[PDB]
Design a protein around this ligand. Sequence first.
Ligand SMILES: *[C@@H]1O[C@H](CO)[C@@H](O[C@@H]2O[C@H](CO)[C@@H](O)[C@H](O)[C@H]2NC(C)=O)[C@H](O)[C@H]1NC(C)=O
Ligand SMILES: *[C@@H]1O[C@H](CO)[C@@H](O[C@@H]2O[C@H](CO)[C@@H](O)[C@H](O)[C@H]2NC(C)=O)[C@H](O)[C@H]1NC(C)=O
Ligand SMILES: *[C@@H]1O[C@H](CO)[C@@H](O[C@@H]2O[C@H](CO)[C@@H](O)[C@H](O)[C@H]2NC(C)=O)[C@H](O)[C@H]1NC(C)=O
Ligand SMILES: O=[N+]([O-])c1ccc(O[C@@H]2O[C@H](CO)[C@H](O)[C@H](O)[C@H]2O)cc1
Ligand SMILES: *[C@@H]1O[C@H](CO)[C@@H](O)[C@H](O)[C@H]1NC(C)=O
Ligand SMILES: [Ca+2]
Length: 640
Amino acid sequence: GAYVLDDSDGLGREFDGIGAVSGGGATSRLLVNYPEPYRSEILDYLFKPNFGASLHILKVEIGGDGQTTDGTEPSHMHYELDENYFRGYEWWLMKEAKKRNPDIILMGLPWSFPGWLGKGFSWPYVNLQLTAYYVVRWILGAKHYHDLDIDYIGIWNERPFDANYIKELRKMLDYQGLQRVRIIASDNLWEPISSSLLLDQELWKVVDVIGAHYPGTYTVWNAKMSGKKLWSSEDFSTINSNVGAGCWSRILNQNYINGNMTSTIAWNLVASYYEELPYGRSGLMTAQEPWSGHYVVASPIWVSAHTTQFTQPGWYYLKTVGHLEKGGSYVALTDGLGNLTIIIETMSHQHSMCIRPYLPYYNVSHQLATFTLKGSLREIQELQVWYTKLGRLHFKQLDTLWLLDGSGSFTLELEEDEIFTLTTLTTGRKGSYPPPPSSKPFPTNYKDDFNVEYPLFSEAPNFADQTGVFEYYMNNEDREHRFTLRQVLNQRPITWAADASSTISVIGDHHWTNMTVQCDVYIETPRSGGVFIAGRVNKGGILIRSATGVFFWIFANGSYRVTADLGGWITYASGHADVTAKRWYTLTLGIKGYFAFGMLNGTILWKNVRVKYPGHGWAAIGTHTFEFAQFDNFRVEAAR
Ligand SMILES: *[C@@H]1O[C@H](CO)[C@@H](O[C@@H]2O[C@H](CO)[C@@H](O)[C@H](O)[C@H]2NC(C)=O)[C@H](O)[C@H]1NC(C)=O
Ligand SMILES: *[C@@H]1O[C@H](CO)[C@@H](O[C@@H]2O[C@H](CO)[C@@H](O)[C@H](O)[C@H]2NC(C)=O)[C@H](O)[C@H]1NC(C)=O
Ligand SMILES: *[C@@H]1O[C@H](CO)[C@@H](O[C@@H]2O[C@H](CO)[C@@H](O)[C@H](O)[C@H]2NC(C)=O)[C@H](O)[C@H]1NC(C)=O
Ligand SMILES: O=[N+]([O-])c1ccc(O[C@@H]2O[C@H](CO)[C@H](O)[C@H](O)[C@H]2O)cc1
Ligand SMILES: *[C@@H]1O[C@H](CO)[C@@H](O)[C@H](O)[C@H]1NC(C)=O
Ligand SMILES: [Ca+2]
């Protein structure tokens, strides 16, 4: 019936911000080659203050060369003695975020690590100082090469922590002059980090924030007892339809209400990865077509706005928040400067399911809500009103609410699936750019000769690596193949996911069913080396080991194989071929209906080989193991 909002008996917890994750893995892969103005528009929808999602926090993966959900992301140290702070796209993204919002909060977290850190094992805690040295290098590089101040550093995403590592990471941070950098742990479940912090005082000192994943709006007792800041450091991961927008809406309020969590960070920031990759379209918005410029400003953008435009890190939650009688919730925040924000949500169970965890039914029905400004809030007379209705009307400003009394009270009619933001703030705006081009399938004729001398990014556009890492490569000591694409991993990473045994990058349209793929290939390893080109590749990401399709392999021992699977268990054809290491060959692979054929240097090697049909999927290139190889003059001709 009546709901009191008061600051007289003090304040709730400090609000730390809403944000999103770019990474885990390659989630922003297709954003980088958007043409202007569209690329800059997308970034504004995300990061420009008083405009769109206006995010307070950007968390990114510290690439470790391993597959991390929708691809691999390049590390700053591929090998021992290697340092490079210009690979990938997270540097660029952080800088674009900071350009639009100087006060944005930056976070880094590793998912995988380069294999050499493991010194013989697939384990990052073999040499604690070495792994901490690697991580801290990254933070220094952000400052030195990009003028970026990383605010938070994590441990090992969704994987075990080592208390001695966390301590060494603190010591190393301090030693390198990074006392200001905070540590968040352990980016997994509430335990065992929470009880570890109660039993170990030295550990308690070095951990600033307990970050838990997909906590279903709740925390646990040991966490409250720690007195540490509690963040949902990874949540959401839901398709960005209205259903996903409802999930985001509900958890933004209730993570604080039910679980004392003062930050929530969505995986992921923008769906800029092929949608047939795992968890397709689970970004706050969608930008998965750089070749057309088409992007979608999805519902979750506006749900974010309802909190982000009208709150800032450093504000405080009131003590007066909770659930509504007939369902839904209300939070309220101030800033100590007389401003007040009220955010109300009425998300129906049927339209707010997150993928993790799934909630048992709860009822939401028509109701009325009365709010009374008690304490030092009563002196407010006027409130701006923002309204959103899911299922649709988005982030629409409604007529101002005048209190018009001396009461300090007001009433609302609330139906289902609604968000209301009521605030003293006048800065709100539903930012708008003209509509962008219609969606178009991936070009049915496509070529890249990789002839780019000073590339802006370290890899060619649209190639999404799924195991291994492929980079622009300049080789002055050749005139015919001076500018190529090279797979640069020479050993398996400390994997997070189950990377394939062979390297692979996919490109194009997963709907393609008839296609001709051509590429110049070059094997660097004598006797043992191997490369392939492929078509109808159907799976990638965390499922890359499962990929089927048609794979045309050539080996440096003078052999070829055609397989139905990336693991090469299922043979379509095999035989001999005039192939050695360190020689350039042109490979052609034709796939049509039930039949395939392969050419070597324009000459038929095998023809009318039966493949499974129907089948559809991307084109790809790769290497037999984690080995050096080059590719040049890539072309694809395909029918969807
Ligand atoms: C964490 O938030 C919870 C609510 O989710 C607070 O626990 C109590 O909740 C009841 C019922 O909602 C309130 O009436 C009380 O005011 C709360 N009790 C306390 C401890 O004051 C709790 O305040 C929070 N826990 C903290 C901050 O340690
Ligand atoms: C409400 O919040 C706004 C946003 O901070 C406050 O506006 C700033 O206030 C400080 C001093 O209080 C000024 O130095 C800034 O220049 C102000 N910025 C703007 C946008 O004018 C404001 O003080 C708060 N109080 C209210 C209700 O106006
Ligand atoms: C891929 O190739 C197959 C084989 O050419 C195409 O399927 C044939 O389509 C014709 C009519 O268009 C039928 O009469 C044949 O019987 C089909 N072949 C088989 C074995 O089914 C198919 O249309 C092509 N797909 C696309 C979209 O390009
Ligand atoms: O299998 N799980 O329950 C599971 C739960 C949380 C996980 O962490 C997260 O999942 C996300 C997808 O929803 C992304 O993969 C993200 O990269 C990963 O950190 C990964 C797997
Ligand atoms: C939910 O609760 C309302 C009001 O109490 C009631 O009218 C309705 O039947 C309930 N719906 C279901 C299916 O639980
Ligand atoms: Ca070239």
